[PDB]
Design an enzyme around this catalytic site. Structure first.
Site, mmCIF file in Angstrom:
data_model
loop_
_atom_site.group_PDB
_atom_site.id
_atom_site.type_symbol
_atom_site.label_atom_id
_atom_site.label_comp_id
_atom_site.label_asym_id
_atom_site.label_seq_id
_atom_site.Cartn_x
_atom_site.Cartn_y
_atom_site.Cartn_z
ATOM 1 N N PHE A 143 0.804 -1.216 0.000
ATOM 2 C CA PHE A 143 0.000 0.000 0.000
ATOM 3 C C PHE A 143 0.837 1.267 0.000
ATOM 4 O O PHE A 143 0.654 2.122 -0.875
ATOM 5 C CB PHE A 143 -0.955 -0.031 1.204
ATOM 6 C CG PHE A 143 -1.786 -1.283 1.265
ATOM 7 C CD1 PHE A 143 -2.670 -1.588 0.237
ATOM 8 C CD2 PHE A 143 -1.670 -2.166 2.330
ATOM 9 C CE1 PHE A 143 -3.433 -2.741 0.273
ATOM 10 C CE2 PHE A 143 -2.430 -3.325 2.374
ATOM 11 C CZ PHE A 143 -3.315 -3.611 1.344
ATOM 12 N N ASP A 182 1.520 -16.684 1.363
ATOM 13 C CA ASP A 182 1.983 -15.814 0.286
ATOM 14 C C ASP A 182 3.371 -16.253 -0.200
ATOM 15 O O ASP A 182 4.186 -15.410 -0.568
ATOM 16 C CB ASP A 182 2.020 -14.343 0.759
ATOM 17 C CG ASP A 182 2.029 -13.309 -0.404
ATOM 18 O OD1 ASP A 182 1.570 -13.640 -1.530
ATOM 19 O OD2 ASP A 182 2.506 -12.151 -0.158
#
Ligand SMILES: c1ccc(-c2n[nH]cc2-c2ccnc3ccccc23)nc1
Ligand SMILES: [Cl-]
Ligand SMILES: [Cl-]
Length: 306
Positions: free
Chosen positions: A19, A127
């Site tokens: 982000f 992930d």
């Protein structure tokens, strides 16, 4: 100010996280180098705070950086952790997008140990990809050891006190990286410890081959492309992935694909299995890694490589 978290001087930008962006920086009390990741505080998906809690939960594990600070700075939250080196994807690229059998075995057993430690602390990682495994800094004791960062997708898979495993469920979202994720992940199934290890098996074959046979597939939508990739994984036998390679890597992938949903993986058995590759090949597990031979033996360089 040029200084965040009281003690950390901001330097140049070294990356971008999910982000916000990531800067390098220096502890102004001891000079220790740090990575500082920013996340907009009024952002739709919050994860930085959870990452801090995960790092503190994992504090002391080899290959997991310390977190030194988390807090609000202006419009952002920041997380300051130890500064690390290039990722295994970076180094794989710089080495011509192939690693020797020896380098793959050696990184594999470190990656197994790292994931084991995550699992031992009641979390699955979810992930797995070469980009999230980073080596150390030049000249440091851990320069060429494998580390693990980015815990934004990590999740508790068992209760910490009772160790009761989470239930199997389906119809989950296809969050993850399509090149490496497990077959179960493609099918929308709840992930467990086996899925982290299956993604590792995919990564090992990627390093050994230079590519996986489900790269470069095309479809009009991301959903359909993930499906074609899952389809290829389901129809490509591990011995076919392993053509011309030590069959221990096929045995590994088949074994972890066979694990029951809640089963504890035999981590040390897997490490001994891949170590037997070096025995077969008359090689030693001596820390010598392909990327250490870059640039005349100097190692990777910001000018020629990065
Ligand atoms: C806080 C700070 C950074 C990070 C981080 N996320 N992804 C990679 C890094 C990173 C972590 C450590 N050293 C690096 C060095 C270069 C690029 C990214 C990193 N996470 C939390
Ligand atoms: Cl979830
Ligand atoms: Cl692709």
């Amino acid at each position: 100010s040029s200084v965040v978290g009281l003690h950390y001087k901001i330097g140049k930008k070294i990356g971008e996280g999910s982000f916000g962006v990531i800067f390098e920086g220096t502890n102004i009390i001891n000079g220790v180098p740090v990575a500082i990741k920013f996340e907009p505080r009024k952002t739709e998906a919050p994860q930085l705070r959870d990452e801090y809690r995960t790092y503190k939960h994992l504090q002391g594990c080899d290959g997991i950086p310390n977190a030194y600070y988390f807090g609000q700075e202006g419009l952002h939250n920041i997380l300051v952790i130890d500064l690390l080196g290039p990722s295994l994807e970076d180094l794989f690229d710089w080495c011509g997008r192939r690693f020797s059998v020896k380098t793959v075995v050696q990184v594999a057993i470190q990656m197994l140990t790292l994931v084991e430690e995550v699992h031992r602390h009641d979390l699955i990682y979810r992930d797995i990809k070469p980009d999230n495994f980073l080596i150390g800094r030049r000249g440091a004791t851990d320069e060429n050891n494998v580390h693990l960062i980015d815990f934004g997708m990590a999740k508790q898979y068992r209760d910490p006190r009772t160790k009761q495993h989470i239930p199997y469920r389906e119809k989950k979202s296809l969050s993850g990286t399509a090149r490496y994720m497990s077959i179960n992940t493609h099918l929308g199934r709840e992930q467990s410890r086996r899925d982290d290890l299956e993604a590792l098996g995919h990564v090992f074959f990627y390093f050994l081959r230079g590519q996986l046979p489900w790269q470069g597939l095309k479809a009009p939508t991301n959903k359909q492309k993930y499906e074609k990739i899952g389809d290829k994984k389901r129809t490509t036998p591990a011995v076919t992935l392993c053509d011309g390679l030590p069959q221990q890597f096929a045995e590994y992938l088949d074994s972890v694909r066979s694990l029951p949903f809640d089963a504890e993986p035999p981590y040390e058995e897997y490490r001994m299995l891949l170590l037997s590759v070096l025995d077969d090949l008359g090689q030693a597990c001596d820390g010598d890694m392909d990327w250490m031979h870059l640039n005349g033996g100097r190692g990777w360089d910001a000018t020629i490589n990065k």
